[PDB]
């Protein structure tokens, strides 16, 4: 039994606030700047959001 | 040669101008002097504008806050639920009279109501009526915050309800589906009753 | 023989030992902890007196009806009171007004308990427009009683439980539709303030300024007060009675910009409201 | 012309100025 | 002005604690008939 | 837009070697996207390292400190 968490997903999010929807075993805080957040650090979320830079 | 003086302090003087600025007007203290009546004629026009204008701003920024900002306070001995999604008088009137009916055990369940939308004057009342059973909170089911100010970690249950009469079935649904969404992100083995579509 | 600070010290040692209590208590919590399923008889006791003033029992219900009435009568009390001279000598043995105002004062006080009982937070109760005027009316009556001498005091005050009563329509079921709620709400406030506001005048104008020995007093009947007022608050203005004393013009000052706006966005809301219908 | 990581510009000035005889 | 008299200590402190003694007799009064009706309607409740 | 963005290269005064930089979003998340699908974490890597940031520590020994 391979649940799917495992499996290499990435996400395109336009609005970073829902990044904290991605993945259930995180502290979410809507402060948190995106590139802190776990789904981010993890590769498994992306937004054109930190192309500004 | 000076004799048009009038014996005015600091503080009379600032009277004064409250006075003619909010257009009351008394005449217990006015200017008598010339150069006074031309600052005066000044004075009506831009102070006034300016009072009419400003007075009414500032009291509206100063008294407008939140209302419902606090948290609610769980006690030992006694569950609490959350409610969210659509309420309105009707939905949240339909729910406490099927909820609190005398039909049912002597329950003590407390009812705390979570949205983004502060009530109207029919629901605070509706509210003031139940006083002792349900309790009302301002914020937004997508606020992570707004969850933990509730206590959702302790709550027995989360009800969400849905608009049944929308125009279009699937804006709604979805609506429902994120707030389902946002509810388990903050706390995944908490209970969700919710409608579909 | 000038006798007000008494009666002013009670009250406000009373709000003052309230709040010292209460940060007290938060601050001792505070220290504590930095350094270190059957719900309760407190809990049983505050759902008791929730329930008893939301007047959702027959009890509740005819003491919310007994708030409103004393109310009134407490306000009626003072209005036939400021006729008085602001110091004079109480019998409490003779004058059946008195003996009316303590059993009001009593009631009140007991109300104001269960109140606190009922609260969830007693620092911002503590602060609410309805704790403050019990503080600053009981207390003063409770000392005039012994001390055998009533001063006019804050009695104005009293005006202000009018307020409440809005809310109190509300736990009686009987105001349902917004439109009434709001009506009720717009005229209870507003009388309210415009009546608590010319006690204030009232009361400043007649006692005159302490630091110039009360040779500032300005002989004005309340009801000259309420019609000042009344003018004051329109931005009419007419110049035959105004403040004298520089508290007066103070109250004069704040009220300018408080009362006018107030009116001015009141009363014809109040009109459009109790004129419109089928 | 090198590209570098780092976290600052004043760390990978220090690579400008290395002195193979300084640093033998 | 009949009632004038010198301020006795006991007077002062009548003056400055008869409001918190007030309070706190009707915070304990209330407390105290909130008790017992508590009990009471428990007593009712359990011996049915 | 990649098709918007092919019309710039029409202008006669767009010339990529005085410095015209049309940064195309989304051609640029793609490119992110596939280098992730060629070894996972690397858009995170890059993007980090196009973004300035300060020396923080944390006093806790947690994944954020390292
Ligand atoms: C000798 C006597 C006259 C001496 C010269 C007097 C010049 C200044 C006259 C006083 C009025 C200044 C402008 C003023 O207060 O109005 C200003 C103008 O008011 C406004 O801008 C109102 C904004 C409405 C929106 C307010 O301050
Ligand atoms: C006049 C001074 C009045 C001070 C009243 C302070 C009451 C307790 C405040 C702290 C608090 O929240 O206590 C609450 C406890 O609430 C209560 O029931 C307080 C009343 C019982 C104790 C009264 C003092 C003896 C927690
Ligand atoms: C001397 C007389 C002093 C009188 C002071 C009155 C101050 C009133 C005041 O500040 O309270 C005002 C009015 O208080 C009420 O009447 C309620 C603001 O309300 P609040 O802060 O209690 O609002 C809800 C609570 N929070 C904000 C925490 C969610
Ligand atoms: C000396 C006496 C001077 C006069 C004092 C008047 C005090 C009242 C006053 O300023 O009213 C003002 C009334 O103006 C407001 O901002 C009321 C809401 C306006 C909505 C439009 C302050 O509010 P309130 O104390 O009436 O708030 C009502 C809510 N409860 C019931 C919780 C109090
Ligand atoms: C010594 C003299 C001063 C003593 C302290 C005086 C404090 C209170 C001043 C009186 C004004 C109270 C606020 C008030 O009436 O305005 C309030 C504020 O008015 C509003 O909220 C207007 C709402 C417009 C919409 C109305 O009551
Ligand atoms: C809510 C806002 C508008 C409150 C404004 C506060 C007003 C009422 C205050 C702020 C500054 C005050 C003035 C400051 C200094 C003086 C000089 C003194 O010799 C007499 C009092 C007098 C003239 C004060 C009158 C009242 C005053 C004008
Ligand atoms: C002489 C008279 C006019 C002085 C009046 C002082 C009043 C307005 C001041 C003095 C002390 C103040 C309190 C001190 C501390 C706090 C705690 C804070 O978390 C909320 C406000 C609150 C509760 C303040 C409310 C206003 C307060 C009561
Ligand atoms: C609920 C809110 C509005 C209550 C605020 C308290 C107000 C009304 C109280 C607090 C302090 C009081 C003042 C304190 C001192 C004196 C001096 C005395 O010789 C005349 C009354 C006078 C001038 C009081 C008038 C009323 C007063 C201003
Ligand atoms: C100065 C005069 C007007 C005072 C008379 C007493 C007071 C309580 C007056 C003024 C405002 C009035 C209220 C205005 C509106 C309503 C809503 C209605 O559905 C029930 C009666 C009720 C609640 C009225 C009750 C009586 C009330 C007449
Ligand atoms: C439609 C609404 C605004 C009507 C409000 C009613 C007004 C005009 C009424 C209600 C309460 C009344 C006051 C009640 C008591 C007193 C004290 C008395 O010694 C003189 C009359 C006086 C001062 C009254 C004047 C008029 C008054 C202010
Ligand atoms: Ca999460
Ligand atoms: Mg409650």
């Excluded at chain 2, 000076?2 to 007007?25: D, I």
């Excluded at chain 2, 102070?47 to 306070?73: C, D, H, Q, W």
């Excluded at chain 3, 005229?187 to 020995?213: M, Q």
């Excluded at chain 6, 520590?57 to 947690?62: A, G, R, S, V, Y």
Aim: neutral net charge; glycine residues 6%; proline residues 3%.
């Amino acid at each position: 039994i391979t649940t799917g968490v495992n499996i290499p997903i990435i996400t395109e999010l336009v609005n970073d606030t829902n990044v904290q929807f991605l993945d259930q075993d995180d502290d979410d805080d809507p402060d948190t700047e995106l590139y802190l957040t776990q789904p981010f650090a993890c590769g498994t979320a992306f937004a054109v959001s930190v192309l500004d830079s | 040669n000076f004799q048009n003086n009038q014996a005015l302090t600091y503080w009379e003087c600032v009277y004064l101008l409250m006075v003619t600025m909010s257009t009351v007007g008394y005449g217990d203290v006015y200017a008598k002097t010339t150069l006074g009546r031309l600052f005066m004629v000044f004075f009506i026009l831009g102070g006034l504008a300016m009072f009419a204008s400003y007075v009414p701003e500032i009291i509206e920024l100063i008294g407008n806050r939140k209302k419902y900002g606090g948290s609610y306070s769980a006690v030992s001995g006694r569950k609490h639920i959350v409610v969210c999604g659509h309420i309105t008088l009707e939905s949240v009137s339909n729910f406490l009279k099927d909820f609190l009916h005398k039909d049912r055990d002597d329950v003590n369940v407390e009812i705390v109501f979570l949205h983004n939308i502060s009530p109207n004057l029919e629901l605070e009342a509706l509210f003031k009526r139940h006083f002792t059973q349900v309790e009302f909170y301002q914020g937004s089911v997508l606020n992570p915050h707004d969850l933990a100010r509730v206590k959702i970690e302790s709550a027995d249950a989360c009800l969400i309800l849905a608009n049944k009469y929308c125009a279009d079935p699937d804006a709604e649904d979805a609506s429902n589906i994120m707030r389902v969404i946002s509810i388990k992100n903050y706390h995944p083995k908490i209970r969700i009753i919710t409608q579909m579509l | 023989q000038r006798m007000w600070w008494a009666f002013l010290a009670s009250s406000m040692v009373t709000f003052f030992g309230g709040l010292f209590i209460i940060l007290l208590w938060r601050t001792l919590k505070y220290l504590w902890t930095v350094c270190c399923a059957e719900v309760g008889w407190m809990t049983s006791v505050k759902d008791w007196a929730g329930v008893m003033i939301s007047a959702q029992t027959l009890t509740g219900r005819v003491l919310v009806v007994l708030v409103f009435a004393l109310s009134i009568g407490a306000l009626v009390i003072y209005f036939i009171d400021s006729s008085n001279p602001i110091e004079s000598c109480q019998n409490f043995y003779k004058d059946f007004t008195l003996q009316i105002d303590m059993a009001f004062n009593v009631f009140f006080l007991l109300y104001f308990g269960l109140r606190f009982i009922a609260a969830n937070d007693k620092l911002w109760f503590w602060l609410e427009v309805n704790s403050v005027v019990d503080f600053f009316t009981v207390p003063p009556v409770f000392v005039s009683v012994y001390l055998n001498r009533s001063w006019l005091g804050l009695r104005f005050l009293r005006a202000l439980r009018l307020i409440q009563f809005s809310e109190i329509l509300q736990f009686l079921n009987i105001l349902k539709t917004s439109n009434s709620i709001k009506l009720v709400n717009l005229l209870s406030i507003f009388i309210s303030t415009w009546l608590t506001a010319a006690g204030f005048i009232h009361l400043v104008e007649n006692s005159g300024d302490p630091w110039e020995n009360f040779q500032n007093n300005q002989a004005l009947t309340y009801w000259e007060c309420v019609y000042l007022l009344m003018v004051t608050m329109s931005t009419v203005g007419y110049g035959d009675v105004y403040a004298k004393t520089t508290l007066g013009r103070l109250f004069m000052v704040f009220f300018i910009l408080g009362g006018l706006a107030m009116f001015a966005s009141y009363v014809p809301e109040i009109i459009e409201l109790i004129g419109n219908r089928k | 012309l090198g590209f570098f990581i780092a976290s600052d510009a004043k760390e990978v000035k220090r690579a400008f100025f290395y002195c193979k005889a300084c640093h033998d | 002005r009949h009632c004038a008299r010198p301020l006795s200590p006991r007077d002062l402190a009548m003056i400055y604690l008869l409001g918190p003694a007030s309070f706190l007799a009707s915070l304990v009064a209330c407390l105290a008939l909130g008790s017992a009706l508590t009990a009471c309607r428990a007593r009712r409740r359990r011996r049915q | 837009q990649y098709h918007n963005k092919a019309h710039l290269l029409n202008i006669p005064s767009w010339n990529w070697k005085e410095g015209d930089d049309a940064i195309c979003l989304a051609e640029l998340k793609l490119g992110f996207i596939a280098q992730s699908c060629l070894a996972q974490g690397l858009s995170t890597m890059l993007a980090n390292l196009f973004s300035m940031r300060s020396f923080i520590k944390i006093e806790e020994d947690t994944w954020q400190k390292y």
